[PDB]
Amino acid sequence: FLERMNTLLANGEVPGLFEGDEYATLMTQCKEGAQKEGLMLDSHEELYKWFTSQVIRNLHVVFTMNP
Amino acid sequence: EAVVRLSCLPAFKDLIAKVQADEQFGIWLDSSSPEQTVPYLWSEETPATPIGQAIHRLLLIQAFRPDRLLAMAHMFVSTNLGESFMSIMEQPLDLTHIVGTEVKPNTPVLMCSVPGYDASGHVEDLAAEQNTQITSIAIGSAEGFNQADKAINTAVKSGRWVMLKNVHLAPGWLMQLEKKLHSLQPHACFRLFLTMEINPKVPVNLLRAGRIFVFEPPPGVKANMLRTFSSIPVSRICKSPNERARLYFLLAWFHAIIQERLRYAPLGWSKKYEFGESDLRSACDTVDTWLDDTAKGRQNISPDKIPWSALKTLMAQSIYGGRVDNEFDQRLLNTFLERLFTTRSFDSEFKLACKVDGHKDIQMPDGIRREEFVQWVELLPDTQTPSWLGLPNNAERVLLTTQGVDMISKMLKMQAWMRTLHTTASNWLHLIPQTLSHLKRTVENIKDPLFRFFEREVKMGAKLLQDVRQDLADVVQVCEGKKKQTNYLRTLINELVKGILPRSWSHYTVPAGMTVIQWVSDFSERIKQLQNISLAAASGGAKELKNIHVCLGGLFVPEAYITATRQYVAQANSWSLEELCLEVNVTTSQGATLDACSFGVTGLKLQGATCNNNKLSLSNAISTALPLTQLRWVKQTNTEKKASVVTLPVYLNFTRADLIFTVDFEIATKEDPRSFYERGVAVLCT
Amino acid sequence: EEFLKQIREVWNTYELDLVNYQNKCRLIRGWDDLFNKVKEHINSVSAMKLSPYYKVFEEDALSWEDKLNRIMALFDVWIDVQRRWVYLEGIFTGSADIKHLLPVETQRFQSISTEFLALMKKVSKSPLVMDVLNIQGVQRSLERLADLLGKIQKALGEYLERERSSFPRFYFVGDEDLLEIIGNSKNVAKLQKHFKKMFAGVSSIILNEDNSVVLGISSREGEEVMFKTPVSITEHPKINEWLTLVEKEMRVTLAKL
Amino acid sequence: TLNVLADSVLMEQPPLRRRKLEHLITELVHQRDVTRSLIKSKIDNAKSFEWLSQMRFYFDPKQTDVLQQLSIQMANAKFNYGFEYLGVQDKLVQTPLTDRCYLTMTQALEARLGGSPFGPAGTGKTESVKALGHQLGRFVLVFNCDETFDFQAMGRIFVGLCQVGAWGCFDEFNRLEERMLSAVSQQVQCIQEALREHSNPNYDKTSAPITCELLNKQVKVSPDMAIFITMNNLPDNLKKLFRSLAMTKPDRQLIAQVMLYSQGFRTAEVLANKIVPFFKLCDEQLSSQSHYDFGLRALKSVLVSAGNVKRERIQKIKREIAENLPEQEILIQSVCETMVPKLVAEDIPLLFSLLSDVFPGVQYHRGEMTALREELKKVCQEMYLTYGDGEEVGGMWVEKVLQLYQITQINHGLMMVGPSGSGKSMAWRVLLKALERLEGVEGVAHIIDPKAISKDHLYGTLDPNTREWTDGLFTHVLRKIIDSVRGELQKRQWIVFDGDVDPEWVENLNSVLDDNKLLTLPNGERLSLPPNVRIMFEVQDLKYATLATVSRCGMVWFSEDVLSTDMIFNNFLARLRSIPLDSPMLQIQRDAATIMQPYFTSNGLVTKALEHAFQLEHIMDLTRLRCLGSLFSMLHQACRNVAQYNANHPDFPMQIEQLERYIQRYLVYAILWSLSGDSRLKMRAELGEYIRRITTVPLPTAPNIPIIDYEVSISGEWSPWQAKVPQIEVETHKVAAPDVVVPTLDTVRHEALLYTWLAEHKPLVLCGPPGSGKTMTLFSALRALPDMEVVGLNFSSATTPELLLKTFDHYCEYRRTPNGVVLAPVQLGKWLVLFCDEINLPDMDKYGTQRVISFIRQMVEHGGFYRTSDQTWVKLERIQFVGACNPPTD
Ligand SMILES: Nc1ncnc2c1ncn2[C@@H]1O[C@H](COP(=O)(O)OP(=O)(O)NP(=O)(O)O)[C@@H](O)[C@H]1O
Numbered sequence A: 001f002l003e004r005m006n007t008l009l010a011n012g013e014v015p016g017l018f019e020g021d022e023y024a025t026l027m028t029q030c031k032e033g034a035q036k037e038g039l040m041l042d043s044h045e046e047l048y049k050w051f052t053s054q055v056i057r058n059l060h061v062v063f064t065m066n067p
Numbered sequence B: 001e002a003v004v005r006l007s008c009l010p011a012f013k014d015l016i017a018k019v020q021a022d023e024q025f026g027i028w029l030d031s032s033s034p035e036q037t038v039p040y041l042w043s044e045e046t047p048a049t050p051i052g053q054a055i056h057r058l059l060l061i062q063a064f065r066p067d068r069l070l071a072m073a074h075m076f077v078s079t080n081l082g083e084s085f086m087s088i089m090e091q092p093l094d095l096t097h098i099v100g101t102e103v104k105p106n107t108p109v110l111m112c113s114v115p116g117y118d119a120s121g122h123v124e125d126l127a128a129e130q131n132t133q134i135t136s137i138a139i140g141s142a143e144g145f146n147q148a149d150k151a152i153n154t155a156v157k158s159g160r161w162v163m164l165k166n167v168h169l170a171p172g173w174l175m176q177l178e179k180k181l182h183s184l185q186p187h188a189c190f191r192l193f194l195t196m197e198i199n200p201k202v203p204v205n206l207l208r209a210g211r212i213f214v215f216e217p218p219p220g221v222k223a224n225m226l227r228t229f230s231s232i233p234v235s236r237i238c239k240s241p242n243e244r245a246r247l248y249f250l251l252a253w254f255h256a257i258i259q260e261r262l263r264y265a266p267l268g269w270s271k272k273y274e275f276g277e278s279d280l281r282s283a284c285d286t287v288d289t290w291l292d293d294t295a296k297g298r299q300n301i302s303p304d305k306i307p308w309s310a311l312k313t314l315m316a317q318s319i320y321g322g323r324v325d326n327e328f329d330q331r332l333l334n335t336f337l338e339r340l341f342t343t344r345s346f347d348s349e350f351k352l353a354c355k356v357d358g359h360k361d362i363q364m365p366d367g368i369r370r371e372e373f374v375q376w377v378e379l380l381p382d383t384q385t386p387s388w389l390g391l392p393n394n395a396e397r398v399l400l401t402t403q404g405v406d407m408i409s410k411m412l413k414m415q416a417w418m419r420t421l422h423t424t425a426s427n428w429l430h431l432i433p434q435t436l437s438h439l440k441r442t443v444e445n446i447k448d449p450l451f452r453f454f455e456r457e458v459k460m461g462a463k464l465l466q467d468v469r470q471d472l473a474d475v476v477q478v479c480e481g482k483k484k485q486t487n488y489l490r491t492l493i494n495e496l497v498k499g500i501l502p503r504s505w506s507h508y509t510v511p512a513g514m515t516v517i518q519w520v521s522d523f524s525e526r527i528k529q530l531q532n533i534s535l536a537a538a539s540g541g542a543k544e545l546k547n548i549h550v551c552l553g554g555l556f557v558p559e560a561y562i563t564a565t566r567q568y569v570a571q572a573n574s575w576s577l578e579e580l581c582l583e584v585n586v587t588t589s590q591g592a593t594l595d596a597c598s599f600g601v602t603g604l605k606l607q608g609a610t611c612n613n614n615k616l617s618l619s620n621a622i623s624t625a626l627p628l629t630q631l632r633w634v635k636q637t638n639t640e641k642k643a644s645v646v647t648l649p650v651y652l653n654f655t656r657a658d659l660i661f662t663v664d665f666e667i668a669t670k671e672d673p674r675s676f677y678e679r680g681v682a683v684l685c686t
Numbered sequence C: 001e002e003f004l005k006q007i008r009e010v011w012n013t014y015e016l017d018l019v020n021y022q023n024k025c026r027l028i029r030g031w032d033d034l035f036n037k038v039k040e041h042i043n044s045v046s047a048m049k050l051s052p053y054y055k056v057f058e059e060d061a062l063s064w065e066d067k068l069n070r071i072m073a074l075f076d077v078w079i080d081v082q083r084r085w086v087y088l089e090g091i092f093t094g095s096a097d098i099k100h101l102l103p104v105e106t107q108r109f110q111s112i113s114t115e116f117l118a119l120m121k122k123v124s125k126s127p128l129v130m131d132v133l134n135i136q137g138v139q140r141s142l143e144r145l146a147d148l149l150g151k152i153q154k155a156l157g158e159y160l161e162r163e164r165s166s167f168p169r170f171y172f173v174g175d176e177d178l179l180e181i182i183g184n185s186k187n188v189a190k191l192q193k194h195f196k197k198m199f200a201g202v203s204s205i206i207l208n209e210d211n212s213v214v215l216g217i218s219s220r221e222g223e224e225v226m227f228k229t230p231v232s233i234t235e236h237p238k239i240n241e242w243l244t245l246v247e248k249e250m251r252v253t254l255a256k257l
Numbered sequence D: 001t002l003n004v005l006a007d008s009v010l011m012e013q014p015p016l017r018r019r020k021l022e023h024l025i026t027e028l029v030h031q032r033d034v035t036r037s038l039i040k041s042k043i044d045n046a047k048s049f050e051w052l053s054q055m056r057f058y059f060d061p062k063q064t065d066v067l068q069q070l071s072i073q074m075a076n077a078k079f080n081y082g083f084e085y086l087g088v089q090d091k092l093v094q095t096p097l098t099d100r101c102y103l104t105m106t107q108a109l110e111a112r113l114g115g116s117p118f119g120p121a122g123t124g125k126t127e128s129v130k131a132l133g134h135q136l137g138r139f140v141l142v143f144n145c146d147e148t149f150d151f152q153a154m155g156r157i158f159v160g161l162c163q164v165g166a167w168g169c170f171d172e173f174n175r176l177e178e179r180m181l182s183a184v185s186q187q188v189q190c191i192q193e194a195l196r197e198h199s200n201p202n203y204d205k206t207s208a209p210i211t212c213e214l215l216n217k218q219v220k221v222s223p224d225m226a227i228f229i230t231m232n233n234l235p236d237n238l239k240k241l242f243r244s245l246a247m248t249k250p251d252r253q254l255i256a257q258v259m260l261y262s263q264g265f266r267t268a269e270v271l272a273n274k275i276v277p278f279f280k281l282c283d284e285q286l287s288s289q290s291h292y293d294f295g296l297r298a299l300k301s302v303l304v305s306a307g308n309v310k311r312e313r314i315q316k317i318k319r320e321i322a323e324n325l326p327e328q329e330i331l332i333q334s335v336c337e338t339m340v341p342k343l344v345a346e347d348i349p350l351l352f353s354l355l356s357d358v359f360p361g362v363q364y365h366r367g368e369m370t371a372l373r374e375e376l377k378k379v380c381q382e383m384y385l386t387y388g389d390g391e392e393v394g395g396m397w398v399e400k401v402l403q404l405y406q407i408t409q410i411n412h413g414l415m416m417v418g419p420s421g422s423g424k425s426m427a428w429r430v431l432l433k434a435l436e437r438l439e440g441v442e443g444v445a446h447i448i449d450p451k452a453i454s455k456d457h458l459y460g461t462l463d464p465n466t467r468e469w470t471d472g473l474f475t476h477v478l479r480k481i482i483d484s485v486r487g488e489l490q491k492r493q494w495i496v497f498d499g500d501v502d503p504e505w506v507e508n509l510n511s512v513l514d515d516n517k518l519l520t521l522p523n524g525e526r527l528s529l530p531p532n533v534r535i536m537f538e539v540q541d542l543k544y545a546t547l548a549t550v551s552r553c554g555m556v557w558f559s560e561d562v563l564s565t566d567m568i569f570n571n572f573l574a575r576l577r578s579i580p581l582d583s584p585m586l587q588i589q590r591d592a593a594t595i596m597q598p599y600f601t602s603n604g605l606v607t608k609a610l611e612h613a614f615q616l617e618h619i620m621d622l623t624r625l626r627c628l629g630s631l632f633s634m635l636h637q638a639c640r641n642v643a644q645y646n647a648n649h650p651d652f653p654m655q656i657e658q659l660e661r662y663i664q665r666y667l668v669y670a671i672l673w674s675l676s677g678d679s680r681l682k683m684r685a686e687l688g689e690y691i692r693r694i695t696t697v698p699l700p701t702a703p704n705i706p707i708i709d710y711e712v713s714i715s716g717e718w719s720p721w722q723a724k725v726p727q728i729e730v731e732t733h734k735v736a737a738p739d740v741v742v743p744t745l746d747t748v749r750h751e752a753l754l755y756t757w758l759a760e761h762k763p764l765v766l767c768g769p770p771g772s773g774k775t776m777t778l779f780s781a782l783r784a785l786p787d788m789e790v791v792g793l794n795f796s797s798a799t800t801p802e803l804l805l806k807t808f809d810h811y812c813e814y815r816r817t818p819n820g821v822v823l824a825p826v827q828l829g830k831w832l833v834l835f836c837d838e839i840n841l842p843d844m845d846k847y848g849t850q851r852v853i854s855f856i857r858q859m860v861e862h863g864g865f866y867r868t869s870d871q872t873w874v875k876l877e878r879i880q881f882v883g884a885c886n887p888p889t890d
């Protein structure tokens, strides 16, 4: 459950989550979001980079412990 | 030491002058029952209550003559909670009232017996007197479970009782029975009895939900022999040549001996062997078969024609001897069998036991039929000393002493810890020496076996000392909470507060049930000895190692010391190890000079005998310390040892569980080696 | 509502995977995935049956639960029929002597296999799960398949117990080993790998040139004991009778030696 | 008769007749001992128990029934010989303990009880039971409890024991699991109750068959069967049904004497009296290791080997009566040949001291083997290795190679064990090529990592429904070898199992390592290992291997003492002088090696610096080969830098004086950055002071700045790193950006180190505390290079080599056109560098190893790996690994 938080914290993405049809669907919704923001299909790796940047500027995960 | 410890109390500060001034204290020490008349020794400013007098006398008995402590213990209760408190316990258990009232039909009655005993007789006889039937059932077989189920259902529906024998073989089904019994039982007269053996596999819930009854076999040779004769059917004894009956008596007597010697586990049998009813039945079958084979007809057969060799060999190597592992217990069993089973046993002058109570002897009955032997059994006097079994009379005293400390342990086992843990750890750190270094591993004189052996000893001793000191420092740091506490340290602190030595600390052999305080004291002694060894090696080298009076008890692996000594003697003069045999000479001087082959050993303690001029003699007093033992390795001359020597074992601690080696001691001409064998004379390293 | 659509499209586009088995049929692979999907769908149907908005989709949820229950009840029998069918196919087709020893059971298995192969061709022609479920009398046929296979398996077990009783030393070898022993009776080469399990020191049998008479026995290290009166397999064709004769003659020749 | 047998056994006999002779000698010795003393002690009656106790045989051939012809009587117990053929079995030496065991066992059997020979393991309880069963000619089955137990076979086995009338002995009953033990005890109780009721005094004439309840059915119980339960207590069910017997101390002094007499030795008594205490001393004085075995079985093996050696010496003398041999010399030589290879280097002087103590004045001379010791020299010279004889540099390693050859000849299933950094792989590689050059038989070695693949991939899997068997790596290799479609027979095939050993992946390997040489696959197929195939276990510690696998394999122990530092230095210098880092480059390498030769001596600067760096504190455990290899790589980079400078200056190239200064300064710089290059600043400073104290090469004259902060320039002078630190001005919008790398002292020093260690493609791990910029520095250095493509893998706590495999599938491709399958990046000319942060974080399994770490080790050391798709060895090119991880103490 942990060390997946650490990677998205140090970089902003977890590369192991997206593969195959999941990666293709993520690519599709990424290009749709690019159209919404005014961008285009461009490159698939570039769309993944756009997804990563949007995650690092938008996502804020909050996680709680007891001392 | 006991007086020194007791004088720490303010009421006993003048104990030393009190004991010196009194002159009847010496005769009081040797009295049969010191607890009856304890001299007024404690110093008190005001007269004390009788309970206080009992407490002070109990303390004195713990100091002087601890063996009577249990007896004194009884007196204390009688002086506090009233006389005849345990008197009902001595009276035979009248459990008919217990099964009538005070026991609900819901609560089962469990009858737990010591292994080798049966409890169904009492309940069966009470059923006979209370004219209520019981469906007695054995739970050995698979059909036994369903049979018990239908029987208990029928009896709870009608109002009868049920029996379930040897239920310790079905623990899970016992739990199921407890769950089933937890339901309401409509009838009130229904009673469920669980005859059973004391075994830890059984459920705790059943024990909690039922009334437990502990049954023991009564101690005494007479009681054991009567039980054996009652167990054997009469027809077996009164059949074939009449001598059979006598033989059975002999067997019975023998059995009783090797059972009653079991209660004295360290002195008399080394370990706690089973020697149960199965061995007795096998011996009975062997005697029956061999008597039938030798004497075809019913006519009486001459005592010399009895196959004595067959019985002796079969009951020394197949029955009663299969479970015997070490050589010396086998030798003792052979001595017993040869003493009893011989053609002399059929004479009127045969002595089953000699030296009993100093001069009295157990004369063998002059009988031919079973009834006379049974009558002789019933006429045995109650004053049965351990001298009947061949043990010295003081063994009983020793046994009582053991029970005494066990009792204390139980009181300790059944009785804010940071402060006391700190003070104990600090005291131990002040007690345990700081550090010894590996001043070893010299290229020159590596060939000396003692050098290598002491290198290994010093290495592993310093290693384990560093480990113990590190753990103790960790405990010190945590008791103030100056650092965190880990799982290993949690286990260590729990084991320390419970008073059991840590498992991570015991890297060498240890007596069972040893307290941490005694363990660390022996640690300090061993570290002092190893530091002396290192100092001698540094000062003189490898030569000085030979001329050291090393104690075997302190050394962690004494057999390795003996091996290294053998190698050292073999290397000098260029001998091979097979040709070196060990010779022990007891020297009075603690620092007597050693020749090229003698090595000094101190701390050896002889039990049951005293040595003078390398000659042994039997004595009542135990733990006769040997002044100095010279171990010599001489070239074997290939001769047969004379009949005036004994091969005494050398155990390491008082619990005779591990054997180090054997010593050939010459005995005085008056005694015989058989008496040495039966009395359990031995040498202890500690 | 959307989850119902997801379930509908999942089970309307689901296809049964088929893998070839010895160029005989195309058998179903992916039992674990299908079972997990069915169990998850059933649990979710029961879960949203508990929902407050369930009254709107009550009839659709009930119909879909009925469909899922039918699918589960079919496939839990289909997997058992599969495992049994491959087991009996392996044992009745890997040997040639199995026909003689159990002829009526072999005929029953031939019938059950013909029916199963017809069903397998039918499902192969339409691998969709809804099409498979809609085929006429699939559950009844599966029940008959399973019960006949269970009965023939019990008969096979009884026959193996009878063979064990006839020759006690067969109790040491396993069920598979004993099956290979009886099935490969004609070729003694496959028998010699089991002789080290039944007998004590015997590791092979020295036979005639045509493997007709058992000339003697041979231990593991090559020591040979020659029977004084050789036992003929051609006269006692049954494996148990001539094996018992071998053991008895071995004891007799040992005594004579 | 004994004299005739002893004369005959000395000659040459076929092995079967040899075994018959030894059995006859043992039985005749026992008979002589019985008659000489136990019967000649004034005994004159045939009914005296001194004679009835001995195992008597009575033959009545007139009886028609075969089972009734021979009667075996002992004490009052009578049995009929079962006449079950036993082949040729090992006969036990009848020690007095064995006689007592026989007496008690037949006494128990007569009373229809069972036998419980309890005692410590290794006293021969199961062997004694088997010998008793074979004496009466009964089939005996031994149910080993070493987790090879089950209900389904055990129930029917009990039914068979009841039916046919065989014997059943349990090797160690106490080791069974509690429920297993209880159920087996229930079945044993049923069987033994049936046996007990079979001899009812009122029902002695058994009219109705004696029956018992097993497998939920009635089973007839034959009167001749029995159950023996060997222990190490008995269950409460069986306490009243079994007779116990203590077998604690077997009489080794008599076993050794009897076997040495059977082997032909004429002084067996003295040799036994020497060799039993000697093995006791070997067990006690010597250090404790898992693989040592000084029990009775080892003594028996040593004695039979000594007999073989004496017979071979007799044959050699004859081809060139003969009873003047030094039998003690033969015994000690056999002991050495059997025990020295599996001894640690520390214990060898201890073993020889014990041998001198017990065998005084008897010396051991090893075999010369000058025929192969010359091919070893040639192969070592051709591999740029170091070879030496005896006390010379190389004696220990060559002796280890000779011992490996000896154990290879003796048996298959070798096990080379030694701490990481010893000459293990090189030893067997050199042995293989030397054998191929000597005998003319081509040697082929298959290197397999058992942990790189799962057990299913290693051995094959069966389809759960399709019932189709697909073979794994080892199974496919064995099948390919046995099929000989190419001619792998007549070629020495060595399946070396590089890696560690755990009781999981070797479960099917016990059946082939032992004398069976048979691999049993789950599908039913059986494979026989051909005689020209040896399976080697190249392991490191042998701490998580069961005794069953260890005892089945001959062993050679490779201590770190074997591979001395001079060996490593000589090999490095030879490779520098011979192998180019790519002729002018070779000339530069030779000049550099000539310059640094004085420092790479026995007591040179490098050795002293190493002995110092060992005492320091390092974040990871120091290994001699790790620092030595990093140093060698950095010197290779120094030579490359010299070549590059010469290329940049076509006129006036590097001169001898300037090259000498540059090489001496670079050597100190490389010692500083290789030894203690993974430590704190204080440790680096301490090592700098120490090397300053010893060395004579010029050092930076500044007494304030530690030398570690300095560097060596191409001109041959010490220059500060601070002068090479540039001043950068990042854009305002890019302050504290994820990718901005402001240069600093660390950023440039580690940059130079990274370039140096990536020139040789050596994988490296940037271990440092969290937040130190390890990944940032690594990415900057990697992406600064134009021909390097970087892929970042975050190793999670559940990371498996499947993540790696997916990585090469996504980024690389398989190409068949070379000699073997090649895994190469899709981009041409681009060296794919696999980034692995948190490389140590993946979890160790139950047996103290990491799966992905072992995969990386295999793919780095060998250059490739086996793919499970078709079980073939793909070779990696244009692929590097770079790692990063937090300190292990975290
Ligand atoms: N030379 C440098 N140039 C630029 N930024 C640097 C430099 N050294 C350190 N930093 C910064 O220091 C921080 C180091 O964090 P980071 O780059 O994530 O290293 P890290 O190895 O991933 N830490 P961790 O993975 O948890 O062990 C980042 O904010 C870097 O930008």
Ligand SMILES: Nc1ncnc2c1ncn2[C@@H]1O[C@H](COP(=O)(O)OP(=O)(O)OP(=O)(O)O)[C@@H](O)[C@H]1O
Binding pocket: D385, D386, D387, D394, D397, D419, D420, D421, D422, D423, D424, D425, D426, D427, D540, D563, D567, D568, D571
């Ligand atoms: N004479 C020599 N014999 C053996 N190795 C030598 C010799 N001279 C130098 N060496 C070096 O010693 C090393 C031997 O390593 P080897 O392959 O034997 O290790 P390994 O035990 O298989 O590895 P690991 O440490 O992973 O277990 C090599 O670096 C080799 O170059």
Ligand SMILES: Nc1ncnc2c1ncn2[C@@H]1O[C@H](COP(=O)(O)OP(=O)(O)O)[C@@H](O)[C@H]1O
Binding pocket: D092, D093, D094, D095, D098, D120, D121, D122, D123, D124, D125, D126, D127, D128, D171, D230, D250, D255, D296, D297, D300
């Ligand atoms: N009396 C004996 N004479 C000769 N060899 C013996 C004797 N007892 C044991 N051995 C040897 O000891 C070895 C191991 O004994 P084993 O039966 O495995 O011990 P355990 O009973 O603990 O399993 C056997 O190979 C056997 O040859």
